[PDB]
Design an enzyme around this catalytic site. Structure first.
Site, PDB file in Angstrom:
ATOM      1  CD  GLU A 133       0.627  -0.384   3.217  1.00 33.77           C
ATOM      2  OE1 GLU A 133       1.149  -1.312   2.565  1.00 33.77           O
ATOM      3  OE2 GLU A 133       0.857  -0.208   4.436  1.00 33.77           O
ATOM      4  CE  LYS A 192       4.888   1.286   1.905  1.00 38.15           C
ATOM      5  NZ  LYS A 192       4.206   2.568   1.615  1.00 38.15           N
ATOM      6  CG  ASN A 196       6.953   3.790   4.128  1.00 38.67           C
ATOM      7  OD1 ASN A 196       6.441   4.295   3.126  1.00 38.67           O
ATOM      8  ND2 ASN A 196       6.234   3.204   5.084  1.00 38.67           N
ATOM      9  NE  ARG A 232      19.056  21.062  -7.744  1.00 44.72           N
ATOM     10  CZ  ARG A 232      20.276  21.533  -7.512  1.00 44.72           C
ATOM     11  NH1 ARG A 232      21.321  21.003  -8.135  1.00 44.72           N
ATOM     12  NH2 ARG A 232      20.455  22.530  -6.655  1.00 44.72           N
ATOM     13  CB  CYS A 248       4.418   2.200   8.201  1.00 42.37           C
ATOM     14  SG  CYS A 248       3.310   0.815   7.806  1.00 42.37           S
TER      15      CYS A 248
END
Ligand SMILES: O=c1ccn([C@@H]2O[C@H](COP(=O)(O)OP(=O)(O)O[C@H]3O[C@H](CO)[C@@H](O)[C@H](O)[C@H]3O)[C@@H](O)[C@H]2O)c(=O)[nH]1
Ligand SMILES: O=c1ccn([C@@H]2O[C@H](COP(=O)(O)OP(=O)(O)O[C@H]3O[C@H](CO)[C@@H](O)[C@H](O)[C@H]3O)[C@@H](O)[C@H]2O)c(=O)[nH]1
Lengths: 425, 431
Positions: A133, A192, A196, A232, A248
């Site tokens: 996700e 993933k 994060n 940038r 997370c």
């Protein structure tokens, strides 16, 4: 292959909203969300959903009972489904599956989750995919309806690419082909995990600068603006705070550190560890500034880890609260969407004597020496501050750990507040 | 109020030179005099062969030179004549040749409190001190100066300070929109530039750390970087894995940031940013080790071609170039290097590597001369010409087995061609 029935094992912050949007966008697909927790499942079929997520109830009620279903009957939904989502659990899938089914991992950690699931399936026709996700809580529905990208990982075999494209077919109902990335299982998991970590790093970097600003008399929001104008670097995720929270970020960074040490990459391990070190530092630094400014009743405004959610996992509010309780402070905690009992659980005796959970923000600041803003709820900037100062013990302090009272500094000072804000002397 | 009509710039370097050429170009009414103690450099500015390689610079210089743009060694005169003095101990020479109202503007990133030190001297003896850091990158200096993302000007929050600040804004407003110009105090401007470069360097170290993880796990860093880059909160720029970042500014700025933090008693913030340098040095050692290891754990008297010596493409600048470190790491193992760079002068390469240089280092005129009889070719700078070379020809005159170590990911898409030719290709961020 065509997917016609989807089962999702997990009715949480990821499982729930994701399937509601899928059922909403794919009316031809029957989506069954299942959970061992009956209390949660009932709440999904109730008018008061078990999680607060802006626009979720509207989306849920649009497709519920039609193609979207919430059940506790797990074994049946697994047997019925062509694709099983996962938000030891692979064992229950095997016991209730026959023929061809696609098993898709959505959770970020454990790092090699899809690799472990595939290991079980060989120890006993199932296909294992990775599909992390990218939604953030608070904006889950908006993120799911128009994501920056969809990431799907599967084996580079004829059967793997057949399952991958079967899942792509689902997203293509509302997600452009240009935004869908296909790769192998591991590259998807690593991507993933790293993304994060990059996100968390931006926050720690701007928080480290906020410390430099307080020390030198600069303003972090002024500095962040100048930094952000470089295309940038970008202007997003540069908001200094008491510290990042959520299920997370810290978990992902720590899992990244462990993988690196497992692979004999100790320098890469120490590189990413600093993201966590800085975050913990920012929290201690903020609590210290509070204790130091107060040479006692304290109001804590906001307990969620971010605004527009009732989630409290790894919330900086927990740590700041516990730091003050350990110094014997009497806390009055208000959060607009965080349930009372969750706050009690988070802080556990000590809670019985020190902690009070208020129904409204004015009840919390009534007789307080200081007010601490930990969550960036929008309502906080629109409160009657003349009224608050009135019923506050004086001198009255305001500790703004989210920069939500910006532009009100003149008003608040003339009222009689002593305002302390992150990233500003 | 105030109007700027004459500008002197002390420093005819990579920042001083191009900046004033664009200013003179955009402000025909303003006389711009670039001055330097180095006569050799100043002569080269008035020569048809400019002392620095910068795409489009000569065209810009020759457009306004001798008209409103001047390069001189007469420093004291240009200082006396000027309304604004750029600085790219030097404040002493300014005082000795200044009378009345002049604006003194610092463009250099470090020392951290440079403008604060200059202002200190001026009070020890009517001068106004501003901070105006450059944001141009070498290789794209002209393009960056004509359309910058933002201009940052810092000055005192006094009536005289804001008067000088707006006097400098007036110059940029000839071609830079008001919306892109940021005004603040002296320190906030210095801190902002320092932090921005640190964020930039951090992005490279972060993606380089992931490249190490990719090589270890059989993922591709360019594939991973693409997925990361599609998040608009992160952005897709500055995510190109390399042998390591170079340049005069990145490591210097990060180290100066670390020192300021330790000076301010913020040791955790110091250790946080130190990791950016630690990772960069690691990436370099890791790349050199991969080379030595692929060549049977010995490179002594083995010929190695080093393609690219500049710290990035489209410049002749070699300061802190990763090419220097990789070269020195291999020389220390006794390798015979053949170095080619399209714009880096021969003598600069010799200086950088100093005996040892006499025995091990050869500087080739062309890339095929360098790979002639080499066991391995190492690409350290992302020059565009490198991807368009005749690789069948190179493999021909190369000692076999022939290795290619691509530390800039420039040979991507050529892997099939290069393998069938007979190369063993090693690339950063890929097993
Ligand atoms: O500029 C910022 C932005 C965020 N935060 C904080 O960082 C934490 C993370 O917020 P956010 O990332 O918005 O919430 P999550 O739901 O944890 O989203 C992250 O975690 C999700 C689950 O893995 C991923 O899907 C998302 O891409 C990723 O952004 C929160 O406490 C925020 O308050 C800041 O302090 N400053
Ligand atoms: O994705 C990337 C981008 C850059 N680099 C390397 O990083 C170094 C820095 O390059 P770059 O920043 O493009 O050149 P500089 O001339 O050093 O420009 C920097 O330093 C200047 C002086 O402070 C600033 O004005 C600029 O904004 C800032 O980009 C070079 O070795 C590049 O090869 C990478 O490895 N990967």
């Amino acid at each position: 292959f065509e997917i016609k029935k989807i089962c999702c094992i997990g009715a949480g912050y990821v499982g729930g909203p994701t399937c509601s949007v899928i059922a909403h966008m794919c009316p031809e697909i029957r989506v069954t969300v299942v959970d061992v927790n009956e209390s949660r499942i009932n709440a999904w079929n109730s008018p008061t959903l078990p999680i607060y997520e802006p626009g979720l109830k509207e989306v849920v009620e649009s497709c519920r009972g039609k193609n979207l279903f919430f059940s506790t009957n797990i074994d049946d939904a697994i047997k019925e489904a062509d694709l099983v989502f996962i938000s030891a659990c692979a064992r229950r899938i095997v016991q209730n599956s026959n023929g061809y089914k696609i098993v898709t991992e959505k959770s970020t950690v454990p790092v090699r989750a899809a690799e472990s699931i595939r290991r079980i399936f060989d120890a006993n026709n199932l296909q294992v995919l990775s599909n992390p996700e990218f939604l953030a809580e608070g904006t889950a529905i908006k993120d799911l309806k128009n994501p920056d990208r969809v990431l799907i990982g599967g084996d580079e075999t004829p059967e793997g690419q057949r399952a991958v494209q079967a899942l792509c077919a689902v997203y293509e109902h509302w997600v452009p082909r240009e935004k869908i990335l296909t790769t192998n299982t591991w590259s998807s998991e690593l991507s993933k995990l790293a993304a994060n970590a990059f996100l968390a790093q931006r926050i720690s970097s701007i928080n480290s600068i906020s410390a430099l600003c307080e020390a030198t008399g600069a303003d972090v929001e002024e500095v962040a603006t100048a930094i952000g104008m470089d295309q940038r670097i970008g202007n997003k995720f540069l908001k200094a705070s008491v510290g990042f929270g959520g299920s997370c970020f810290q978990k992902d960074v720590l899992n990244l550190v462990y993988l690196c040490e497992a692979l004999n990459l100790p320098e890469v391990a120490r590189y990413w560890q600093q993201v966590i070190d800085m975050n913990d530092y920012q929290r201690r630094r903020f609590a210290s500034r509070i204790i130091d400014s107060l040479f006692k009743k304290i109001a804590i405004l906001g307990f969620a880890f971010k605004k527009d959610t009732g989630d409290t996992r790894e919330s900086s509010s927990i740590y700041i609260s516990k730091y003050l309780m350990d110094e014997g402070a009497h806390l009055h905690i208000y959060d607009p969407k965080v349930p009372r009992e969750q706050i009690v659980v988070d802080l556990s005796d000590q809670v019985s004597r020190l902690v009070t959970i208020s129904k409204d923000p004015y009840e919390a600041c009534d007789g307080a020496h200081a007010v601490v803003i930990c969550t960036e709820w929008d309502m906080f900037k629109e409160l009657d501050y003349e009224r608050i100062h009135k019923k506050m013990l004086k001198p009255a302090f305001i500790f703004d750990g989210r920069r939500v009272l910006d532009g009100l500094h003149n008003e608040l000072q003339t009222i009689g507040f002593q305002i302390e804000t992150i990233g500003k002397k």
